[PDB]
Amino acid sequence: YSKHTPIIVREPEDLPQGFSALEPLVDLPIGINITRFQTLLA
Amino acid sequence: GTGVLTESNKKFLPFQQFGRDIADTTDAVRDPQTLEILDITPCSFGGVSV
Amino acid sequence: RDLICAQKFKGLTVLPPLLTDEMIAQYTSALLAGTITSGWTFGAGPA
Amino acid sequence: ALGKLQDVVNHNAQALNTLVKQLSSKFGAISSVLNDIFSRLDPPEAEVQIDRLITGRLQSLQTYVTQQLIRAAEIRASANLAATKMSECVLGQSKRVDFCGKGYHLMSFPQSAPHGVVFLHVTYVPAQEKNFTTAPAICHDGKAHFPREGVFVSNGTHWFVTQRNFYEPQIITTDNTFVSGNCDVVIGIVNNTVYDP
Amino acid sequence: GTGVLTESNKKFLPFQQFGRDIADTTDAVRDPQTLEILDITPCSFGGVSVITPGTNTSNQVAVLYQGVNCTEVNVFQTRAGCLIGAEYVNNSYECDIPIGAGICASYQTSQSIIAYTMSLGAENSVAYSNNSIAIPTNFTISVTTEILPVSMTKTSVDCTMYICGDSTECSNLLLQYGSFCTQLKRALTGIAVEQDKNTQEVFAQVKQIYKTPPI
Amino acid sequence: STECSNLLLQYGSFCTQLKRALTGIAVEQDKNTQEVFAQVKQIYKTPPIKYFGGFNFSQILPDPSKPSKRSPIEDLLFNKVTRDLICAQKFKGLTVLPPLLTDEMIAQYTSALLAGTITSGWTFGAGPALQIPFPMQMAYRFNGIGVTQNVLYENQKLIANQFNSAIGKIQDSLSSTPSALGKLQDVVNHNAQALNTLVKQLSSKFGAISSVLNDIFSRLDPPEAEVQIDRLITGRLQSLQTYVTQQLIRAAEIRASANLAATKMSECVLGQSKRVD
Ligand SMILES: *[C@@H]1O[C@H](CO)[C@@H](O)[C@H](O)[C@H]1NC(C)=O
Ligand SMILES: *[C@@H]1O[C@H](CO)[C@@H](O)[C@H](O)[C@H]1NC(C)=O
Ligand SMILES: *[C@@H]1O[C@H](CO)[C@@H](O)[C@H](O)[C@H]1NC(C)=O
Ligand SMILES: *[C@@H]1O[C@H](CO)[C@@H](O)[C@H](O)[C@H]1NC(C)=O
Ligand SMILES: *[C@@H]1O[C@H](CO)[C@@H](O)[C@H](O)[C@H]1NC(C)=O
Ligand SMILES: *[C@@H]1O[C@H](CO)[C@@H](O)[C@H](O)[C@H]1NC(C)=O
Ligand SMILES: *[C@@H]1O[C@H](CO)[C@@H](O)[C@H](O)[C@H]1NC(C)=O
Ligand SMILES: *[C@@H]1O[C@H](CO)[C@@H](O)[C@H](O)[C@H]1NC(C)=O
Ligand SMILES: *[C@@H]1O[C@H](CO)[C@@H](O)[C@H](O)[C@H]1NC(C)=O
């Protein structure tokens, strides 16, 4: 799921107070065993 | 099913194919052919009194 | 579709009453035209 | 204000809203829509798994009919009470307490309302009370005098006869007091003088 | 099963192993180990109710657990159970939210939910005396209002649309069932006729229709 | 049972009408106890000097020499209508909610009604309380049946003697003839029979290998277990629906009875009624 919403400048970094639904984009099949997750930046 | 299939002015999102009503009954559907929004209304019915 | 029409498309219907609001209003006004003009005589015999 | 009229409407609305939400509930089948069991199973299994939904829907409809019958009995009782009040309060003055409003009933006006009636009852509410000294009867010329229709009160120094629901001082004459018995059997009899015209 | 194995004082017979209650519920068993008489009481269960002044003035709510001594879940213990979220004020007012055992609750001033015993009215003492009468001196004729339901909505159902939907085999299989689709319609028709008759006995009590004079 | 818990949720939201109906019945029963007793606004109290013309209510007025501020007649009537059965039914689901108006509040309402009837007479139900002697009160109540007041004002002694004798005969009759408080025991016996029938049907098979859900989930296979447990999950819901329908019918009957009782208390206690019987 994904959704872009205006995050106009506010108090120090924190999750803003506002409802926003998330619509699905892709539904790729998978059959893995995922129990962990590692991020990555440029 | 049965009933009239009219043209609907809804706002079906690209991921929403089917559609239900207040009583969880199929009121709108997406055509398996070229994408079009329809409205499934039941056939003409009523009651007779003599 | 509103709730009134959604229930209609499922079999459930609502029959209209026999006495409309106008007739009930006329009945209520006829009882006031006898209670104010007359007394308790328009319910027993002649007004 | 209109609480007892909205209650029946909300009940009749929830009875219809709950009757249509039970059509999406499977009573032991693999689906809820009718054109789903007759499109994936064979007749030997279709005639078995589709009856489990028909039976449940029939039971739900019977439950709704029973609830409607009970509600109609309650509405019939309320309508009989309303007709009795309309015939005994509007078509005449009734001496029944609380039946035509709290207080002394005098008059009633009916008004219509969505699936209901509204009675406006005119009630006689006494106020501005005052204490007085009472007595069962008085004794004049040796004989007792009991009030015909009223009550004996005393402003301290004089005894008068007034109404039972409104203060109206009147002299004790031989027109509202009858003589019955001598002055040796009533407990609390006072003396005075009965002025005759 | 599940429960709280406690020590009981039941004198079981030397051959009995299990044990039931008045109405079909196991409440005591014999230990398969060294002989001991136990008691199987059900686990800690109860009902939960929420007292709320409405989502229009505040959002503070109170939780009432039914059937508990406040030691099995401010905190108050009433004959209805255990109330958490309110405070038992020693005052007395009219009941607003009925909770039970003559203890209601309200939302008062800091604004919070308070609990209090109901008030049965004022406290007036009539001075009775063997020579005392209260005669009114003035009238206060008033007009009160009462509401009475007279009629209900007239509904009607159908088997071919409610039981079956847009199908044909379902309508054929429904015919094999009993006369469950002609007695319910008859009952609904009777209810409709009764509702149409309840208006003819309340608002229709005079033959002629009178009119008010112009002046 | 967790499988039964999941099957009940899969069976739909059918367990929402029964709870709402029971809540409505409870609200109606709480309202019936208020529209009958709680008819007066202010609470009246009996005067200390208990000399009401010569009559003697030392049996209907609340006695201070007892815990719950009741009267001898009320004390005799309360101690007449009768793991235990209540806790056993509570451990199964049949739990009784406590009423809103307690016994002490009902007793205080009945005492205030008696105080208003004795001190005020028939004026406390139509407005403010009006002090009036009890002899004159009963003398003005005779003028509604034809008998004038000169009969009471001459035979007050005999009237008080007959009243004091009848008050004692009331207690004498209530102490015997067990078929007297039958209509109050009728509803209690009906409720007990209903609660017993609703709990006995849990050991009656609607068609299955047994009545224990654990034995069905264990000593069977899923394709047959899902069919055997349905026959028991459908019978219990029908039994509970039948119980709810019986409770609704009985609540309607008791509502009619309570309306009749309120009409009687408003027409017989709050004043003199000229209706026969
Ligand atoms: C998935 O990962 C978990 C990690 O603990 C493992 O236990 C499990 O066997 C794996 N297989 C699946 C698909 O459950
Ligand atoms: C083929 O199917 C797709 C489904 O979205 C539809 O959009 C398209 O118009 C169809 N084309 C033909 C040849 O029917
Ligand atoms: C009568 O006297 C009593 C006792 O003093 C008092 O409470 C009451 O208010 C008096 N009523 C009037 C209006 O005189
Ligand atoms: C009582 O009434 C008599 C009527 O003659 C009057 O003369 C007297 O002044 C009154 N006294 C009081 C206390 O009202
Ligand atoms: C009334 O008068 C008679 C005769 O004078 C007397 O015996 C009696 O005591 C008097 N009673 C009162 C109420 O003053
Ligand atoms: C089991 O063995 C223990 C050993 O101390 C004994 O106390 C107990 O009574 C025995 N119970 C049975 C079932 O024989
Ligand atoms: C009587 O009571 C009414 C109440 O509205 C008041 O307006 C009027 O002034 C009063 N009159 C007397 C007699 O005191
Ligand atoms: C009058 O009332 C008092 C109240 O204490 C009572 O004792 C007395 O017996 C009554 N009778 C009389 C003397 O008027
Ligand atoms: C009232 O009757 C009761 C009956 O037991 C008696 O004990 C009491 O003394 C009586 N009181 C009076 C004042 O007659």
Side-chain angles (χ1 to χ4, degrees), chain A residues 1-9 11-42, chain B residues 1-6 8-35 37-50, chain C, chain D residues 1-101 103-148 150-197, chain E residues 1-6 8-35 37-78 80-93 95-168 170-206 208-214, chain F residues 1-2 4-40 42-48 50-68 70-277:
Chain A
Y1 301 86
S2 179
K3 174 61 177 59
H4 188 192
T5 171
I7 193 238
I8 55 100
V9 291
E11 298 291 340
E13 299 181 0
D14 64 330
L15 195 61
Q17 298 182 179
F19 192 90
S20 60
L22 311 177
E23 59 278 353
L25 295 186
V26 297
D27 192 65
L28 55 97
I30 202 176
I32 203 182
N33 185 212
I34 172 185
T35 56
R36 286 153 64 96
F37 162 60
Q38 162 64 25
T39 185
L40 57 153
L41 285 75
Chain B
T2 78
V4 200
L5 311 178
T6 60
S8 61
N9 50 15
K10 300 300 180 300
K11 48 269 291 84
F12 276 76
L13 298 182
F15 74 98
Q16 300 178 176
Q17 290 79 206
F18 296 157
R20 294 181 180 271
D21 202 70
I22 309 297
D24 300 70
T25 56
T26 301
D27 187 70
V29 77
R30 166 169 275 95
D31 197 308
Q33 275 68 19
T34 167
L35 304 182
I37 43 180
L38 283 73
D39 196 332
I40 304 181
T41 164
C43 199
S44 57
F45 65 94
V48 295
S49 303
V50 184
Chain C
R1 174 167 59 257
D2 58 328
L3 183 61
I4 304 300
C5 188
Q7 299 177 175
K8 180 180 300 300
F9 290 163
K10 213 62 67 272
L12 309 184
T13 55
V14 178
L15 302 181
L18 179 59
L19 297 180
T20 59
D21 300 0
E22 181 69 21
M23 296 182 177
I24 304 180
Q26 292 181 1
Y27 267 152
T28 54
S29 63
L31 299 179
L32 295 177
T35 312
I36 302 179
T37 61
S38 179
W40 52 77
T41 60
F42 77 128
Chain D
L2 280 307
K4 52 213 308 297
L5 285 186
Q6 276 284 161
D7 183 72
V8 292
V9 179
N10 294 17
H11 291 355
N12 291 273
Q14 67 182 1
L16 295 176
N17 277 91
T18 322
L19 193 62
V20 299
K21 292 186 285 81
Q22 295 183 2
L23 294 180
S24 60
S25 60
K26 49 182 61 180
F27 299 93
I30 33 76
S31 180
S32 179
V33 187
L34 291 317
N35 299 330
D36 280 59
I37 306 181
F38 293 156
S39 301
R40 68 178 64 259
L41 294 174
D42 41 66
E45 289 290 340
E47 278 76 303
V48 174
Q49 297 192 15
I50 233 295
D51 297 3
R52 303 175 64 177
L53 299 181
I54 300 180
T55 303
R57 293 186 179 184
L58 260 303
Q59 291 180 0
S60 63
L61 191 57
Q62 175 184 344
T63 311
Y64 172 77
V65 169
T66 303
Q67 256 65 86
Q68 288 292 151
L69 285 173
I70 299 179
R71 195 99 48 78
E74 188 272 346
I75 291 299
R76 183 187 299 103
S78 180
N80 288 274
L81 179 60
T84 305
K85 292 187 180 180
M86 175 85 68
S87 60
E88 298 183 8
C89 307
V90 184
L91 300 180
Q93 182 183 11
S94 61
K95 295 176 270 65
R96 300 171 59 180
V97 184
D98 119 293
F99 186 81
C100 307
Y104 295 91
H105 168 54
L106 298 181
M107 192 164 44
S108 295
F109 295 147
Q111 303 296 332
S112 60
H115 299 349
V117 71
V118 178
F119 290 104
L120 303 179
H121 295 322
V122 178
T123 60
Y124 177 89
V125 180
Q128 297 185 6
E129 318 300 331
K130 186 131 60 64
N131 291 343
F132 301 94
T133 300
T134 181
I138 75 276
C139 189
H140 182 55
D141 299 332
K143 58 265 299 300
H145 298 68
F146 300 90
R148 286 185 170 91
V151 55
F152 284 157
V153 300
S154 183
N155 72 348
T157 171
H158 289 73
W159 289 86
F160 297 144
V161 44
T162 60
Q163 305 176 8
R164 301 179 182 179
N165 296 323
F166 186 83
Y167 183 75
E168 183 180 0
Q170 296 180 359
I171 53 180
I172 303 179
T173 58
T174 60
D175 187 70
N176 57 273
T177 56
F178 59 94
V179 179
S180 180
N182 42 340
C183 310
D184 51 69
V185 68
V186 43
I187 300 180
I189 178 174
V190 302
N191 291 359
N192 199 255
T193 163
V194 180
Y195 158 77
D196 59 84
Chain E
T2 176
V4 187
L5 304 179
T6 60
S8 59
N9 59 331
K10 300 180 180 300
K11 300 178 300 300
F12 288 173
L13 296 184
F15 83 104
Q16 298 177 348
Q17 299 291 340
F18 299 155
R20 294 180 183 272
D21 74 330
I22 303 180
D24 300 329
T25 298
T26 300
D27 54 354
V29 296
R30 178 181 297 270
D31 199 319
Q33 298 291 152
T34 170
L35 300 182
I37 311 301
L38 289 316
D39 195 323
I40 300 185
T41 170
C43 193
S44 306
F45 67 94
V48 179
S49 59
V50 178
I51 286 84
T52 305
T55 323
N56 193 88
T57 57
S58 179
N59 299 270
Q60 300 179 0
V61 303
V63 185
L64 172 72
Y65 302 94
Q66 302 176 355
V68 62
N69 196 5
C70 293
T71 57
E72 211 179 2
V73 181
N74 300 89
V75 173
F76 185 80
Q77 169 63 26
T78 180
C82 194
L83 182 60
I84 299 180
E87 51 276 1
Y88 185 85
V89 58
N90 298 20
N91 299 20
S92 183
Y93 307 99
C95 176
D96 298 73
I97 301 179
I99 304 184
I103 308 298
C104 293
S106 65
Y107 186 83
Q108 294 292 340
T109 302
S110 180
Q111 298 287 156
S112 60
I113 290 291
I114 65 176
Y116 56 92
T117 313
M118 297 190 299
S119 180
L120 305 184
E123 192 77 5
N124 183 23
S125 60
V126 181
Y128 181 82
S129 166
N130 338 326
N131 52 356
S132 62
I133 180 62
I135 298 298
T137 67
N138 184 14
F139 50 74
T140 48
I141 282 87
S142 61
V143 171
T144 180
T145 170
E146 63 177 0
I147 326 291
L148 290 172
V150 185
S151 60
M152 194 189 59
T153 61
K154 302 184 301 179
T155 179
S156 59
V157 309
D158 175 63
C159 275
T160 62
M161 293 188 60
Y162 182 82
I163 310 302
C164 308
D166 301 0
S167 55
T168 59
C170 179
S171 300
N172 302 331
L173 267 61
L174 184 59
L175 299 180
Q176 273 65 219
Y177 289 89
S179 61
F180 296 92
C181 294
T182 182
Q183 59 180 0
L184 303 183
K185 297 183 60 60
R186 176 168 55 257
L188 293 182
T189 305
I191 292 180
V193 172
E194 175 269 346
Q195 296 299 331
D196 294 326
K197 187 180 60 60
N198 290 10
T199 60
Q200 298 287 349
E201 60 180 0
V202 178
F203 298 94
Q205 297 180 175
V206 291
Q208 301 176 352
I209 300 300
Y210 310 101
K211 299 180 300 300
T212 171
Chain F
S1 300
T2 169
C4 186
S5 300
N6 294 272
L7 182 61
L8 181 60
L9 299 180
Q10 292 291 341
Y11 232 90
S13 60
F14 189 84
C15 287
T16 310
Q17 305 178 189
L18 310 178
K19 299 180 60 180
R20 183 168 57 185
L22 294 180
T23 304
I25 292 180
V27 172
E28 174 267 339
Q29 296 302 327
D30 293 326
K31 185 181 80 284
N32 288 12
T33 59
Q34 184 179 0
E35 61 180 0
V36 177
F37 298 95
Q39 292 181 180
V40 291
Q42 302 175 352
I43 295 300
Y44 305 95
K45 298 92 63 179
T46 170
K50 298 181 179 300
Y51 183 81
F52 299 145
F55 298 84
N56 177 3
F57 306 95
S58 300
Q59 299 187 11
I60 67 177
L61 295 181
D63 179 67
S65 62
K66 73 149 298 181
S68 58
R70 283 197 299 264
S71 66
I73 301 183
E74 290 177 0
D75 295 332
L76 193 147
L77 292 175
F78 262 89
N79 300 331
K80 184 175 298 302
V81 179
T82 61
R83 179 171 62 257
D84 55 327
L85 181 60
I86 300 300
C87 190
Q89 293 173 171
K90 182 179 61 60
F91 282 158
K92 194 56 81 284
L94 308 179
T95 167
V96 175
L97 301 181
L100 180 60
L101 292 172
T102 59
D103 305 71
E104 181 68 22
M105 297 181 177
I106 299 180
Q108 184 174 172
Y109 272 149
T110 55
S111 64
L113 290 177
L114 296 179
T117 307
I118 293 180
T119 59
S120 180
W122 55 9
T123 60
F124 77 127
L130 305 186
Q131 55 183 13
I132 173 179
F134 197 85
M136 299 185 59
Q137 174 184 347
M138 286 199 60
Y140 291 158
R141 290 179 177 270
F142 281 175
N143 299 328
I145 66 178
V147 180
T148 58
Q149 54 184 352
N150 60 80
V151 180
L152 182 135
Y153 287 150
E154 293 179 0
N155 302 269
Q156 180 181 354
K157 299 298 298 180
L158 182 58
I159 291 180
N161 295 330
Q162 293 181 1
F163 182 83
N164 298 332
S165 300
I167 291 300
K169 290 187 300 180
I170 287 299
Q171 287 189 1
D172 296 330
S173 179
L174 289 179
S175 60
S176 60
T177 68
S179 180
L181 280 305
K183 50 214 309 298
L184 282 185
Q185 278 277 174
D186 182 72
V187 291
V188 181
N189 295 330
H190 290 355
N191 296 330
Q193 176 268 166
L195 294 178
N196 292 17
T197 307
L198 195 60
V199 75
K200 187 180 60 60
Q201 289 169 334
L202 295 181
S203 60
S204 63
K205 304 177 300 300
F206 301 95
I209 58 177
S210 60
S211 300
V212 180
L213 291 80
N214 300 20
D215 301 0
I216 301 181
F217 292 156
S218 60
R219 198 185 67 260
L220 250 182
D221 48 76
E224 289 289 342
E226 295 291 339
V227 185
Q228 293 295 338
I229 198 60
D230 179 70
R231 299 175 56 90
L232 296 184
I233 215 272
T234 311
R236 294 184 178 182
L237 265 303
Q238 182 68 209
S239 300
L240 192 52
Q241 172 188 344
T242 309
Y243 173 80
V244 169
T245 301
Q246 256 74 195
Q247 288 296 95
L248 285 171
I249 297 180
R250 194 177 307 165
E253 188 272 345
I254 295 184
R255 182 190 300 106
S257 180
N259 292 16
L260 178 60
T263 303
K264 291 185 180 300
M265 188 180 296
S266 300
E267 295 180 4
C268 307
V269 180
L270 302 182
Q272 181 182 4
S273 179
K274 294 176 295 300
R275 301 170 60 179
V276 184
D277 119 293

